[PDB]
Curated annotation (Swiss-Prot):
Family: Belongs to the invertebrate defensin family. Type 1 subfamily.
Disulphide bonds in the chain: 3-34, 20-40, 24-42
Protein name listed in UniProt: Defensin
Induction field: By bacterial infection.
Function comment: Responsible for the anti Gram-positive activity of immune hemolymph.
Places the protein is found: Secreted
Taxonomic source organism: Anopheles gambiae (African malaria mosquito)
Segments forming a coiled coil: none
Superkingdom of the source species: Eukaryota
Range within the parent protein: 63 to 101 of 102
Length: 43
């Protein structure tokens, strides 16, 4: 998807929605999984 498109290899912190997004969900967020820029900010 966004940022983590095709063969993922972002030169920053891995989106890892499986864990990062899951944590986001804990706080009423949809899921990070790398935002528009390249940070897994919860949203």
């Amino acid at each position: 998807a966004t940022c983590d498109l095709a063969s993922f290899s972002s030169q920053w912190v891995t989106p890892n929605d499986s864990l990062c997004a899951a944590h986001c969900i804990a706080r009423r967020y949809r899921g990070g999984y790398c935002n528009g820029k390249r940070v897994c900010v919860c949203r």
